[PDB]
């Protein structure tokens, strides 16, 4: 046995294109839509839970997930790709930085960490990269609010607002004409809404999507009291309810 | 053309070697069916045993992974008690590690992300066989989670898998429509053992003997699997109404 | 070994060692050197357990030698005995570590500027005017604090370390055979023959 | 591609094969062994004239007792040589004594097939190692990449091989002197070498029993060309 | 296509190519049987004799695993003899353990696991041979067959090799005319004769027979070989049947 | 780790790769050594397609590996540093366990050897270099030129060039130099170095470097006025 | 053709060509003849030289005072499986004051070149060997090929025109089997047995090599003035 | 087995090019021009950001000009992601030398050690090299003000200007043509900008589409200040320049 | 605490002559006061012509004589049945028991 692939499963063809990495964004392009826009006080990310049979139950699978109290991510392109990156944001998020430092990353810095994991796998001997483009919304204290975009190449890019995946293109346009600099989360919840409605086909409904918001903090989501200095959790995952109440002013 | 031989990416974005691995998932020509009760998950199986020569004892695609993980496999016999092996080996782990059971959907996670590095690792192939994992979870209540190839699993009401899980997943589907509920409404495990024999039959258009079925039932702090005389005695509580 | 001292003076730094080697009632010789040349500016004395003492300055002469061919550049006395220093820190918590003092004297060509450091065994670095290791200090200290002058020459420098030999000539229990003396400054270094 | 210790349809390993191609291409060394000793001869070959052809070393020392001429990728050579001379003084460390030649040459014939995917490829050099002990005495040996090694009376390899084999074919007999054997390797080295024959292009050694393995002076082959060129033009 | 030239890769079909090759090396071997008893199992298998030159009874191809077990096979013998070295130290280890000796089944899934882990890299080979194996344990009789994919089952009769047609055709009957079951001294009988009547795909060269057998009653459920008296009978009983 | 077979033999019993070293090596900007009587002296081309550089912080061409032996080469310029590096090492380990500082011979031998085992190592190639090494051995007067390449042979040399267009520099050197009779001075042999860099340089501007070793340590890289004057007297002489 | 790169894949047909190919090299070889009574066994080896300035390649290996072999192929195959038989054999006595079956030897080879044929990147061995010896079992003689195969014959021979010695040895089966208590005439039979794969050259003293094991008689070899006497 | 996979990516073509580290810098001349020019008191640092957007946020926005320590920063060109791992390691090199020596890193020392990394994937290993190329922009008391660069060949050379990226060669000749050597930083900030303007495959040069970066001895007394440009204060030097 | 080492006691000598040499050792094996056997060899005939007894302790004189005659029989493998010479055994066993240098073999050696 022994992994004997130690050789680069990614290289540079003749014309400068590294195929693996560009196969992998084709993959991207084929996924769902998902989209994050930012706020004045907070960011939003939503996607469609594009439920693969009616059988299936669709709250089981999480496409919007935390990764800390005040980080969350949302994914176009292949699934399990994601969950798994997602598992190892996590885990990144705590040995190289929260026992060190005794406090969870500035979102920037927990995107460097997943888009070094990212190029790895476009580098490292036999493995192909991460089939998925990653859209993480989060908060932290002398930054504020953030919106990042990472890509299959380990690449990353700040977001005010922006759409990945399968109607990317057109969202991307839709947002260019809403977005301003001046907008509070219910406007970017609203726009949020609007931009993904177009590139949805079946029922639109707070079932069939998955929204969550980077606010302001939940002391009832905390679990204890007595600790001033901790005030709760800002990444908030908005309910079935919640979605629909929003929908009826639309 | 070596896009194809191993997994990774082809120009259109696509991994040849996992869908071929699904492919392989029907070779067994075996079709499997699990629904909830309100006390139960129940798992039927088709069972096919051609050959006289063969112990049909020892003709099995259903695995006791714990006490309360029932597994059904759809493909191959190698790929499939790999898998059985692994899952043993993880859920008698998780038990010492953590202090309690582990959970059906848990479990599905695990084992769909072992499957996920099959499909970004070179060295190590996919395996082609589709898992179906079955419990009632001591939090979730009846659980089906499913995983593939691919490294994609979910929960689920109900679930078929094999050449013609469309006709069940359709037949189910149906019932479902008219129900309005998230489950098969009755008290025994009996009785739901008897509904999903009973929609398979309608789903497949054909009549099963008590050596045709393979049977695996799901309760509070147990899994099981059902003899030929217990599913004779479903057989005639059928057939009597 | 037993006896090395070090002087910063005006204009360069003075270092002086015993020139006895003994092991157990025998002195095995009175002519040895007990120092290593860094680099052209840069001088090393040392004193210790035996065998650790001379495998540790050539080890630290191989590396800096290699450093002045690599970059064509001669290292300052202050990067030089953070090296030494950073290599005595990490082997005591080695499995056997280097049981070796030293003391680095060095002319400074940039800042024209002479400087002596004092490291231990553990580490323990230390820039001073003057400085010995092991029970010479306990003798050179005391003298040193009275007729130190920070402007003092070379030639005033040689008198006062002609003093403190003398002291220890005097009340010492050990024949260390007198001390071999170097001057290190602007020009590079040499050795004073009559002592 | 295709893997280096692969075995072609007739049974042979393509890599050793094709490094025995390599050594063709290589400078002539001529070995004859005699009762009164071993001679060992070599083509330098220099490239150009402004070369100086004294750091040619391709006759090499491995004991007081055993000799070595090499042929082919002489870079090669070097980890071999290190190797039978470790070997040598080891195993006299070892017993207090010489070692045989017969088990020097299966010390480094014991590398040669030490390549897969150890080292990536065969060595693309032959041997010629001779010397003396007192079971076997006076030896010549032929080593390959292959890890074979033949004993020989009288063995020439390099590009004029074949030619200067058939050549000691019918020269070499059981009573040759020595001075008969170093003529002859002067000889029919000359008959195979592209350029003129020299003091300065060609080499001599011998191993005798009483003074060892040495390396002929430029002076002393010299002669040994005079005396060779007057005997022929004897008759 | 491309598919077949290299070990653990799905073709479009979703079939691994180089084990079904394996299989043919399986086909090309000599035939071996696995009889399942009332109490035990009998292992048969077909010698060819090649030549004069080769001594008789001493070329033993049946291998014991522990002291319960018994393991035949065919095709490429060096694979099974691999297989049987590694079937020990899992029974070893297993008894090391758990100190009763290794129940048929688990024995079964040891070597399984271990078949298929040679499917799953194209840096090994898969398995060139189809074993029958079996034994008695605390659970009673058990017989097995194993496949070069890593795919076994429990079996009535089992056969493999160039003559496993004609040899099932043979178990089927047996199957059909005794659903009360077999004994163990009847099962050498037939054993012999089957592998008789499959040497008829080898009917080239002569053969020689070698048959074992593990039954609680006539061995105390250990593996032995079949030796003298019993072996000329069922020879005999063979012999018969063909003419 | 890595351990594919790079360097191998071909039908022909050829290693393609050491050869497609060489050829990296013929690509590289031409180097030239000159041993007088007294001297050795290593000549060097600059291409002048690159202008605007800083040729105060530029790596040099010529690198001392310790103070009496000096190292220039042909080919990929990554690949020299990595072998001047190791030679480096190896200078001040062998002054330590010997206590004697390398002969010219034995640090040509250890740079060779190097090149040598990465030409038979899974997973590396061979180096695209060729190396001039030059010097004094210690306490000898007699000057030393060797020159290596990727498959790892060696050999000492009166006069030698490596690089591009080498075999027109390599042609003047043969008829030019006098085996009998050497460049007897320091100016002498530096001329003739100058001279048959002329026949390939292009301009005698900033093109061309040259480095003069003599014995006991005495190294001394020439500036671009004092090659300049060796330029225009060599020219003055040439018109007639 | 395609399925002939590597030892790790089998043909369409179920073969593997490494190991074939491996095969091929033994019928290059040199002859070698192997054949036994109930007292004795013997090896007979035809030595093969490079030319008339050559020595002849050694064909016989000893392994223990009880054991050794004969080769055919590639020479340092066999003298890598011969140190490992040496390496057995001495395990064998060192830790069960134990003298190594000849047949447990066979076992003990064939597992050795069986994971030379399964696993990638190596090769298959390149050589063919005869095993005669002597244990508590009496005379034996065993036949080892690379593919992993061994077994034990009253007689054999391998090597290029070997087929002329093994049925000559197939006739004179009943009569060699009973050659008890003499030496000189079993390797007579084992002299007449590889003569009958000669063509144009004949067994000189320096060509032909001989080795006996038996009852009383440590496993010796052969060579020189010594097997003159049965020219 | 695995052998049938393996592209080889440290091997010489029969012209003697190292295949995969051409194919890098084909890679890299796609990338968005990046120019360093040295003057006597001081360097600039300029690099285009490739085809942004209106809603990239670009105030806290960084792809092109990177901080290695207080004295020496970089210009990256090629593939971000790569560069952000040799950024790392250079870092840390930076930071072993001054516990060490106690002393700041010398420039050349920290290039010649990120070229040397850059080496070794062309030359062992099995995989594919960095597609990135550095221009590296610092000062240290030896040399004073530096200029290098490195590509994924590991060779790298000192300049008094030099470009990286898309365009050099119509970029390198502008340089080549308005620089001399008694220039000024103030100076330097204008050829750098002026030559964006002139290469540049967009339409017009503005201010979200830059990057900027200066190493000054402009701090009080003697030492050197680095400054990374702000969004607002690149929109003023280019109305200064007559730019927009 | 376990003590790795024990004494059987006993007692060697050897002589050589002028075409001859003789190695004597008594035959008595002890623990303490108490006797093992009155007959246990402790002189061993190890081929080519040598003798060897080592004395001791007699779990390392065993495993030295046993490791020697294991010398003898590989030098005769890898050097074509050359006889081992007494001079070459005394250099073989130097290597033998400096092998052990921090662990010895607690035996005084006579060939
Ligand atoms: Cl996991």
């Not at chain 1, 109607?167 to 947002?175: I, Q």
């Not at chain 4, 430029?218 to 060309?225: D, F, M, Q, R, S």
């Amino acid at each position: 046995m022994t992994d004997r692939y130690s050789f680069s499963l990614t290289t540079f063809s003749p014309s400068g294109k590294l195929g693996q990495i560009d196969y992998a964004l084709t993959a991207v392009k084929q996924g769902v839509t998902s989209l994050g826009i930012k706020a004045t006080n907070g960011v939003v990310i939503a996607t469609e839970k594009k439920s693969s049979s009616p059988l299936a139950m669709s709250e089981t699978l999480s496409k919007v997930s935390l990764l800390t109290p005040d980080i969350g991510a949302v994914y176009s392109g292949m699934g399990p790709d994601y969950r798994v990156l997602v598992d190892k944001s996590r885990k990144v998020a705590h040995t190289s930085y929260k026992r060190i430092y005794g406090e969870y990353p500035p979102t920037k810095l927990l995107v460097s960490e997943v888009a070094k994991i990212m190029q790895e796998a476009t580098q490292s001997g036999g493995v192909r990269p991460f089939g998925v483009s990653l859209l993480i919304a989060g908060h932290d204290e002398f930054n504020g609010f953030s919106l990042y975009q990472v890509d299959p190449s380990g690449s990353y890019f700040p977001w005010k607002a922006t759409a990945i995946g399968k109607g990317s293109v057109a969202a991307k346009t839709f947002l260019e004409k809403r977005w301003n600099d001046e907008l509070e989360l219910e406007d970017a919840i609203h726009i949020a809404l609007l931009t993904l409605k177009e590139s949805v086909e079946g029922e639109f409904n707070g079932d069939t999507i998955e929204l969550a918001i980077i606010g302001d903090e939940n002391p009832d989501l905390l679990g204890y009291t007595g600790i001033p200095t901790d005030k709760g959790p800002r990444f908030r995952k908005l309910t079935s309810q919640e979605i629909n109440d929003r929908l009826e002013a639309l | 053309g070596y896009d194809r031989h191993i997994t990774i990416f082809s120009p259109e974005g696509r991994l040849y070697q996992v869908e071929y691995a699904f492919k392989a998932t029907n070779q067994t020509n075996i079709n499997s069916l699990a629904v909830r009760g309100k006390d139960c998950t129940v798992v039927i199986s088709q069972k096919k045993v051609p050959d006289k020569l063969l112990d049909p004892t020892t003709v099995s695609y259903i695995f006791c992974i714990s006490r309360t993980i029932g597994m059904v496999v759809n493909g191959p016999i190698p790929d499939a008690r790999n898998a059985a092996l692994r899952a043993k080996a993880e859920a008698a782990e998780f038990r010492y590690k953590y202090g309690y059971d582990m959970p059906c959907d848990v479990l599905a996670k695990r084992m769909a992300n072992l499957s996920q590095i099959y499909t970004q690792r070179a060295y190590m192939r996919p395996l082609g066989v589709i898992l179906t994992f079955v419990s009632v979870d001591e939090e979730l209540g009846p659980s089906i989670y499913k995983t593939d190839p691919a490294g994609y699993y979910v929960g689920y009401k109900a679930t078929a898998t094999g050449p013609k899980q469309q006709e069940i997943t359709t037949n189910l589907e149906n019932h479902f429509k008219k129900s309005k509920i998230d489950h098969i409404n009755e008290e025994s495990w009996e009785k739901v053992v008897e509904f999903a024999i009973t929609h398979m039959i309608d789903a497949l258009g054909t009549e099963f003997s008590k050596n045709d079925l393979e049977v695996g039932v799901a309760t509070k702090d147990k899994f099981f699997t059902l003899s030929a005389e217990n599913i004779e005695e479903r057989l005639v509580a059928i057939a009597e109404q | 070994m037993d006896i090395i001292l070090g002087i910063r003076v005006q204009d360069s730094v003075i270092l002086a060692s015993s020139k006895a080697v003994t092991r157990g009632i025998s002195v095995l010789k009175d002519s040895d050197d007990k120092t290593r040349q860094l680099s052209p500016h840069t001088l090393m004395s040392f004193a210790g357990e035996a065998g650790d003492t001379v495998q540790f300055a050539e080890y630290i002469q191989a590396n800096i030698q290699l450093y002045s061919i690599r970059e064509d550049y001669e290292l300052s006395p202050q990067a030089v005995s953070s090296f030494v220093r950073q290599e005595l820190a990490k082997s005591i918590r080695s499995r056997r570590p280097y049981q070796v003092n030293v003391l680095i004297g060095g002319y400074d060509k940039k800042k024209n500027k002479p400087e002596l450091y004092q490291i231990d065994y553990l580490g323990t670095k230390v820039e001073l005017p003057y400085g010995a290791h092991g029970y010479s200090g306990f003798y050179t200290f005391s003298l040193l604090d009275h007729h130190y002058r920070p402007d003092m020459t070379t030639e005033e420098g040689l008198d006062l370390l002609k003093l403190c030999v003398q002291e220890l000539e005097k009340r010492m229990p050990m024949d260390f055979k007198g001390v071999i003396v170097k001057i290190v400054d602007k020009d590079g270094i040499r050795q004073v023959d009559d002592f | 591609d295709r893997g280096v210790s692969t075995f072609s349809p007739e049974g042979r390993l393509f890599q050793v094969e094709y490094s025995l191609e390599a050594i063709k291409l290589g400078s002539t060394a001529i070995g004859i062994a005699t009762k009164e000793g071993v001679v060992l001869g070599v083509e330098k070959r220099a490239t150009s004239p402004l070369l100086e052809s004294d750091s040619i070393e391709k006759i090499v020392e491995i004991d007081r007792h055993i000799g070595c001429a090499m042929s082919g990728l002489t870079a090669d050579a070097r980890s071999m040589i290190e190797h039978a001379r470790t070997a040598a003084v080891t195993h006299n460390l070892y017993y207090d004594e010489d070692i045989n030649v017969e088990s020097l040459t299966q010390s480094v014939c014991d590398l040669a097939l030490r390549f897969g995917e150890l080292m990536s490829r065969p060595f693309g050099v032959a041997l010629l190692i001779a010397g003396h002990d007192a079971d076997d005495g006076y030896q010549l040996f032929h080593a390959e990449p292959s890890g074979t090694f033949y004993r020989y009376n009288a063995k020439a390899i390099g590009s004029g091989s074949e030619g200067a084999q058939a050549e000691l074919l019918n020269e070499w007999h059981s009573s040759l002197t020595l001075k008969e054997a170093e003529l002859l390797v002067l000889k029919i080295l000359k008959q195979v070498m592209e350029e003129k024959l020299d003091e300065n292009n060609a080499q001599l050694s011998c191993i005798t029993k009483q003074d060892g393995f040495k390396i002929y002076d430029n002076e002393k082959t010299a002669e040994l060309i005079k005396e060779l060129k007057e005997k022929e033009a004897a008759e | 296509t491309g598919y077949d030239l290299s070990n653990s890769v799905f073709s479009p079909d979703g079939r691994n190519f180089q084990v079904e090759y394996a299989v043919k090396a399986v086909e090309n071997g000599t035939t071996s049987i696995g009889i399942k008893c009332n109490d035990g199992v009998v292992f048969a298998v077909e010698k060819l004799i090649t030549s004069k030159l080769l001594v008789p009874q001493k070329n033993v191809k049946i291998q014991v695993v522990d002291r319960h077990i018994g393991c035949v096979y065919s095709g490429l013998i060096p694979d099974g003899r691999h297989l049987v070295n590694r079937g020990r130290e899992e029974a070893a280890s297993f008894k090391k353990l758990y100190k009763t000796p290794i129940p048929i089944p688990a024995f079964a899934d040891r070597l399984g696991q271990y078949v298929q882990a040679h499917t799953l890299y194209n840096s090994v080979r898969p398995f060139g041979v189809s074993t029958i194996f079996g034994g008695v344990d605390k659970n009673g009789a058990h017989l097995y067959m194993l496949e070069p994919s890593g795919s076994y089952w429990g079996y009535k009769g089992a056969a493999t090799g160039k003559g496993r047609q004609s040899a099932k055709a043979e178990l089927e009957k047996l199957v059909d005319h005794h659903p009360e079951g077999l004994s163990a001294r009847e099962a050498v009988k037939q054993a012999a004769k089957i592998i008789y009547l499959a040497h008829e795909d080898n009917k080239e060269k002569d053969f020689e027979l070698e048959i074992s057998w593990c039954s609680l009653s006539e061995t105390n459920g250990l593996h032995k070989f079949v030796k003298g008296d019993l072996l000329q009978e069922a020879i005999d009983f063979a012999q018969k049947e063909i003419n | 780790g890595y351990d594919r077979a790079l360097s191998i033999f071909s039908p022909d019993g050829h290693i393609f790769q050491v050869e497609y070293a060489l050829e990296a090596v013929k690509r590289g900007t031409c180097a030239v050594g000159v041993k007088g009587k007294n001297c050795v002296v290593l000549g060097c081309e600059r291409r002048s397609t690159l202008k605007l550089q800083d040729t105060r912080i530029t790596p040099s061409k010529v690198s001392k590996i310790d103070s009496h032996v000096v190292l220039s080469f042909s080919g990929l310029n990554a690949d020299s540093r990595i072998l001047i590096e190791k030679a480096r090492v190896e200078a001040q380990s062998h002054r330590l366990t010997l206590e004697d500082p390398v002969t010219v011979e034995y640090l040509t031998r250890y740079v060779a050897g190097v090149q040598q085992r990465y030409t038979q190592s899974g997973g590396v190639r061979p180096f695209g270099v060729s190396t001039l090494i030059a010097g004094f051995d210690p306490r000898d007067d007699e000057p030393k030129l060797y020159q290596t390449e990727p498959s790892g042979i060696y050999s000492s040399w009166s006069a030698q060039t490596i690089g591009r267009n080498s075999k027109t520099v390599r042609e003047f050197l043969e008829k030019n130099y006098d085996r009998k009779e050497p460049p007897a001075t320091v100016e002498e042999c530096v001329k003739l170095t100058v001279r048959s860099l002329l026949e390939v340089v292009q301009t005698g501007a900033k093109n061309i470097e040259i480095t003069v070793v003599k014995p006991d340590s005495d190294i001394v890289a020439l500036s671009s006025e004092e090659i300049n004057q060796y330029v225009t007297q060599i020219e003055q002489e040439k018109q007639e | 053709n395609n399925y002939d790169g590597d030892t790790v894949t089998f043909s369409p047909t179920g073969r593997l060509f490494q190991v074939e190919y491996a095969l091929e090299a033994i019928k290059q070889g040199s002859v070698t003849v192997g054949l036994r009574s109930n007292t004795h066994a013997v090896l007979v080896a035809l030595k093969r030289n490079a030319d008339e300035l050559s020595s002849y390649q050694k064909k016989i290996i000893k392994c223990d005072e009880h054991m050794g072999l004969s080769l055919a192929g590639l020479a340092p195959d066999a003298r890598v499986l011969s140190n490992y038989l040496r390496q057995q054999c001495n395990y064998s006595s060192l830790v069960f004051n134990r003298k190594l079956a000849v047949e447990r030897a066979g076992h003990l080879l064939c597992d050795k070149a069986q994971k030379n044929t399964q696993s990638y990147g190596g090769r298959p061995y390149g050589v063919g060997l005869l095993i005669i010896g002597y244990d508590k079992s009496g005379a034996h003689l065993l036949e080892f090929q690379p593919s992993g195969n061994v077994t034990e014959l009253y007689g054999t021979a391998i090597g290029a025109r070997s087929q002329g010695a093994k049925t000559y040895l197939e006739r004179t089966l009943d009569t060699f089997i009973k050659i008890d208590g003499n030496p000189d005439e079993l390797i007579k039979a084992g002299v007449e047995a590889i003569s009958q794969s000669l063509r144009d050259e004949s067994l000189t003293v320096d060509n032909l090599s001989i080795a006996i094991v038996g009852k009383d008689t440590p496993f010796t070899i052969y060579d020189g003035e010594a097997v003159a006497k049965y020219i | 087995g695995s052998r049938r996979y393996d592209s080889r990516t440290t091997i010489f073509s029969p012209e003697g090019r190292l295949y995969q580290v051409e194919y890098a810098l084909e890679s890299i001349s796609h990338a968005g021009t990046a120019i360093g020019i040295m003057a006597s008191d001081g360097i600039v640092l300029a690099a285009e950001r490739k085809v942004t957007s209106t809603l990239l946020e670009q105030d806290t926005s960084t792809e092109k000009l990177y901080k290695l320590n207080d004295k020496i920063a970089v210009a990256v060109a090629g593939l971000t992601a790569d560069a952000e791992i040799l950024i790392n390691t250079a870092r840390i090199h930076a930071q072993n030398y001054l516990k060490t020596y106690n002393e700041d890193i010398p420039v050349e020392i920290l290039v010649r050690r990120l070229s040397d990394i850059k080496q070794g994937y062309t030359q062992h290993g099995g995989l594919r090299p960095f597609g990135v190329s550095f221009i590296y922009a610092g000062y240290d008391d030896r040399y004073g003000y530096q200029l290098y660069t490195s590509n994924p060949s590991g060779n790298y050379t000192g300049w008094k200007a030099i470009s990286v990226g898309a365009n050099t060669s119509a970029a390198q000749t502008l340089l080549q043509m308005d620089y001399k050597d008694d220039m000024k930083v103030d100076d330097a900030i204008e050829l750098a900008l002026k030559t964006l303007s002139k290469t540049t495959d967009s339409s017009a040069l503005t201010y979200d589409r830059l990057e900027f970066a200066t190493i000054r001895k402009g701090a009080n007394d003697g030492e050197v200040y680095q400054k990374i440009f702000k969004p607002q204060e690149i929109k003023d030097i280019l109305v200064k320049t007559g730019i927009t | 605490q376990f003590n790795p080492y024990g004494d059987n006691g006993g007692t060697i000598l050897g002589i050589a002559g002028e075409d001859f040499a003789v190695l004597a050792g008594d035959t008595r094996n002890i623990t303490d006061y108490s006797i093992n056997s009155r007959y246990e060899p402790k002189v061993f005939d190890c081929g080519d012509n040598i003798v060897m007894s080592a004395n001791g302790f007699a779990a390392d004189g065993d495993a030295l004589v046993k490791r020697f005659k294991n010398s003898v029989k590989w030098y005769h493998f890898d050097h074509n049945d050359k006889k081992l010479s007494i001079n070459s055994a005394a250099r073989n066993i130097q290597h033998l028991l400096y092998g052990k240098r921090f662990f010895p073999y607690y035996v005084h050696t006579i060939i």
